[PDB]
Amino acid sequence: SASAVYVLDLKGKVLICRNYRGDVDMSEVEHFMPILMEKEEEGMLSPILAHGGVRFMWIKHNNLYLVATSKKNACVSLVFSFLYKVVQVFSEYFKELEEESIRDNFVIIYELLDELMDFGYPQTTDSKILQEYITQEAPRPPATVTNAVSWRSEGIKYRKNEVFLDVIEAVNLLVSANGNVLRSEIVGSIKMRVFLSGMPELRLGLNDKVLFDNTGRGKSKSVELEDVKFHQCVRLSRFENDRTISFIPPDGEFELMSYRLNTHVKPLIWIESVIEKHSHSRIEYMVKAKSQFKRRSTANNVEIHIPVPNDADSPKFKTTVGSVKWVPENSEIVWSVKSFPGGKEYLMRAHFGLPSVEAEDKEGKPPISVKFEIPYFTTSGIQVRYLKIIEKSGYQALPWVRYITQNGDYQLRTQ
Amino acid sequence: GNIFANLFKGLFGKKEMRILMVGLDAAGKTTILYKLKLGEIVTTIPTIGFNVETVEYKNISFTVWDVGGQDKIRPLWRHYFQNTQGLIFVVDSNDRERVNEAREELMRMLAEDELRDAVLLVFANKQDLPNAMNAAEITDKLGLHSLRHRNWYIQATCATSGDGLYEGLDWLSNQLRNQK
Amino acid sequence: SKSSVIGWPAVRERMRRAEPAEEVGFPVTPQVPLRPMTYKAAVDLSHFLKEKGGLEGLIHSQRRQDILDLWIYHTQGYFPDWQNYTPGPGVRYPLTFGWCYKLVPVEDPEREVLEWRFDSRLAFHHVARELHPEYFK
Amino acid sequence: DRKGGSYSQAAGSDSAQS
Numbered sequence: 046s047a048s049a050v051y052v053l054d055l056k057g058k059v060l061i062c063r064n065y066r067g068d069v070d071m072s073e074v075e076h077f078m079p080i081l082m083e084k085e086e087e088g089m090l091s092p093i094l095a096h097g098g099v100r101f102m103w104i105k106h107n108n109l110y111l112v113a114t115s116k117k118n119a120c121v122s123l124v125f126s127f128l129y130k131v132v133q134v135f136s137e138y139f140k141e142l143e144e145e146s147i148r149d150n151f152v153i154i155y156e157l158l159d160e161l162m163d164f165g166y167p168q169t170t171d172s173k174i175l176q177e178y179i180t181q182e183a184p185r186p187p188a189t190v191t192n193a194v195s196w197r198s199e200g201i202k203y204r205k206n207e208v209f210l211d212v213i214e215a216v217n218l219l220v221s222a223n224g225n226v227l228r229s230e231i232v233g234s235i236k237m238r239v240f241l242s243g244m245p246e247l248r249l250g251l252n253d254k255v256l257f258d259n260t261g262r263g264k265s266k267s268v269e270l271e272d273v274k275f276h277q278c279v280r281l282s283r284f285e286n287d288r289t290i291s292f293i294p295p296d297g298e299f300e301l302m303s304y305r306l307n308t309h310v311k312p313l314i315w316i317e318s319v320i321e322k323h324s325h326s327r328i329e330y331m332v333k334a335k336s337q338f339k340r341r342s343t344a345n346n347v348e349i350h351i352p353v354p355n356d357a358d359s360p361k362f363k364t365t366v367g368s369v370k371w372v373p374e375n376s377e378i379v380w381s382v383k384s385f386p387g388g389k390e391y392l393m394r395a396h397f398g399l400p401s402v403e404a405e406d407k408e409g410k411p412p413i414s415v416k417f418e419i420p421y422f423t424t425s426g427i428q429v430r431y432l433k434i435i436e437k438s439g440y441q442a443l444p445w446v447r448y449i450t451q452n453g454d455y456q457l458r459t460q
Numbered sequence: 461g462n463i464f465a466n467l468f469k470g471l472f473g474k475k476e477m478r479i480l481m482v483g484l485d486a487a488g489k490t491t492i493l494y495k496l497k498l499g500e501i502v503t504t505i506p507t508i509g510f511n512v513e514t515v516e517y518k519n520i521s522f523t524v525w526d527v528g529g530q531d532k533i534r535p536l537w538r539h540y541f542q543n544t545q546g547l548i549f550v551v552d553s554n555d556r557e558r559v560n561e562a563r564e565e566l567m568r569m570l571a572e573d574e575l576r577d578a579v580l581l582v583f584a585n586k587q588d589l590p591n592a593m594n595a596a597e598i599t600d601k602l603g604l605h606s607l608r609h610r611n612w613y614i615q616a617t618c619a620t621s622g623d624g625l626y627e628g629l630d631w632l633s634n635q636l637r638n639q640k
Numbered sequence: 641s642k643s644s645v646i647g648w649p650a651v652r653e654r655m656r657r658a659e660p661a662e663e664v665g666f667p668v669t670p671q672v673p674l675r676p677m678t679y680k681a682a683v684d685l686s687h688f689l690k691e692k693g694g695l696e697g698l699i700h701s702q703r704r705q706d707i708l709d710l711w712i713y714h715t716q717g718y719f720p721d722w723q724n725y726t727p728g729p730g731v732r733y734p735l736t737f738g739w740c741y742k743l744v745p746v747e748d749p750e751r752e753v754l755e756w757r758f759d760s761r762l763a764f765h766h767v768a769r770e771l772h773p774e775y776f777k
Numbered sequence: 778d779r780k781g782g783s784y785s786q787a788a789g790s791d792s793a794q795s
């Protein structure tokens with residue numbers, strides 16, 4: 046129940062404002078900046094502000110804060126969803142999200158803001174559907190918005206019917222300083238770029254554990270996805286009935302399903318780091334990386350970030366494989382490895398100086414995060430079984446998909 | 461890469477080296493530094509802070525950083541321990557009561573993991589009174605032979621006369637430089 | 641299939657060596673298609689096994705079945721899920737339609753000795769589907 | 778070629794489940 050959706054800037058200036066109900070005065074935006082400054086300076090800053098009887102709930106963008114003022118007991122989740130949809134629409138329409146496009150795309154920005162939400166209730170949020178009625182370079186609105194299928198425009202025709210899938214894995218490990226992993230969860234991400242002719246009804250089928258148990262084949266390798274979040278095109282009723290994933294893919298790249306299940310296996314990359322930091326004399330970084338993944342998979346672009354001292358200077362790196370560079374901007378040692386074959390072991394011996402004068406305040410111990418990305422390796426073991434592409438006209442589709450294994454929240458707690 | 465310029469510089473002398481001047485107050489450290497740099501016994505007030513100078517001998521710039529022996533300046537020797545290659549210890553054989561304090565200070569300064577490449581340089585200062593010990597009694601009392609991984613050398617230098625300064629400089633050059 | 645013919649003798653020898661009663665990860669061949677075994681493919685595989693021998697009358701074992709499924713997946717890209725038998729006790733029919741192989745008693749269904757037996761009626765009659773309509777959807 | 782694993786063709790349905 047937002048009252049006025051406005052876009053701020055880094056200096057407190059409102060780049061663009063669009064009131065939807067008019068119950069909140071436009072002058073309340075000026076007090077948002079002082080309120081945010083006071084909250085940040087006292088540790089009480091939150092995404093949802095409160096200027097008397099008006100609440101300023103907004104998120105932080107790349108360069109401006111999309112604060113949406115409200116007065117009644119409006120749904121905070123609804124406001125956040127509307128802000129996320131607006132950000133996604135802006136990203137789809139404008140390649141950059143900064144002040145350079147706010148002051149240059151006002152003619153289309155105002156129209157998009159007016160069409161997106163009326164009276165504080167959003168009605169259209171699909172960038173592909175919205176691009177057929179609001180352009181910066183007007184016909185009647187498309188029937189897709191009025192029709193039930195609001196995520197697949199009818200009449201799309203292509204020379205070929207090729208759909209590219211992307212089974213991107215997210216290996217997140219929360220390893221404590223004692224050496225044990227506390228939060229070790231892998232979140233799947235099935236992103237597909239559907240490019241076909243017409244409005245095909247995709248019938249996604251994988252080796253799900255529940256599906257295998259229902260069919261009676263609960264004995265082979267099945268992915269045990271604890272949480273499965275289907276897209277808007279995916280029919281919730283069909284999935285709830287008999288695990289049938291039937292939905293119409295959209296035109297372009299979109300996220301169909303987002304699996305999320307816990308992982309009880311050993312980490313793909315094991316980092317054994319030591320800190321022989323002398324008392325204002327020197328420091329030693331005996332960091333050893335052990336690859337627990339399969340030898341057939343190579344972790345391309347392996348970047349194990351080792352947090353070095355903030356005031357360290359004149360550092361020396363004695364490693365074995367991969368270039369080690371210290372970035373003063375980040376205040377950490379970037380153990381960058383181009384190719385990391387499975388089962389490899391890289392040993393590094395850091396050595397940096399330290400000023401004689403002790404620091405005035407503590408700096409903390411940021412966790413060590415690895416950036417391993419091993420392609421063609423599915424940690425969860427989930428493999429796509431079938432993709433039922435059915436069209437009324439009748440055509441031979443050529444579906445494709447690739448499995449990518451990367452590191453998500455794979456941080457290692459320091460000592 | 462090419463190292464022709466480095467070879468040309470080394471053909472006529474390129475190494476300079478460094479040195480440290482630490483010890484108890486009134487131990488002849490300032491007078492020793494003045495004699496090494498100038499060659500005269502200059503009377504100076506107690507070193508509240510520190511004195512930094514350089515000595516040119518044998519084509520090596522022997523930079524000397526005098527450090528006072530004051531109680532408020534005794535724990536300040538760690539400031540000069542950074543980017544330090546040498547260390548010279550000035551003993552006070554004329555102060556029997558201060559000999560233990562000087563030995564304790566030397567042991568504390570020698571028990572640091574950062575100052576490891578600095579070889580020992582014991583200078584017998586105030587070598588003009590009959591109460592001054594020899595070059596072995598002072599070392600035996602200080603236990604210089606028990607300093608593992610430390611290259612120490614005891615040399616007796618007279619502040620008023622200046623004898624033994626050349627021998628100490630030659631020993632320091634031989635310990636620092638390992639060439640012909 | 642020259643590759644299938646070559647792998648049949650080695651697969652049969654490995655199955656015979658394994659009695660009737662280390663590397664982590666799931667590598668995937670780049671560009672190798674992966675899909676469930678088809679009824680026609682299952683029928684062709686059953687016919688080839690019957691002609692070459694080594695599968696009809698062999699003692700059914702978990703290790704031998706797993707090795708055969710792995711070899712079939714390696715040589716054809718078929719998922720090792722179509723080689724399922726109906727629950728016992730008694731004669732177990734193939735779960736996937738078109739399979740000509742079935743398990744029959746040779747003497748709790750788990751302790752009963754079972755052996756692979758060729759059955760051409762399996763490729764035409766959905767015995768597994770009829771026995772377990774719920775499992776067939 | 779493509780970084781992150783080469784794209785592989787997908788099936789149409791579970792042919793082994795009828």
Ligand SMILES: Nc1nc2c(ncn2[C@@H]2O[C@H](COP(=O)(O)OP(=O)(O)OP(=O)(O)O)[C@@H](O)[C@H]2O)c(=O)[nH]1
Nearest residue numbers: 485486487488489490491504506507528586619620
């Ligand atoms: N007359 C005489 N006095 C000496 C001799 N050797 C050491 N001293 C005494 O040692 C003191 C040396 O002080 P400085 O040269 O100013 O520097 P320092 O040795 O670091 O002493 P502080 O400045 O107090 O730390 C003099 O004041 C002398 O009293 C010596 O050979 N003859």
Ligand SMILES: [Mg+2]
Nearest residue numbers: 489490507526
């Ligand atoms: Mg002095």
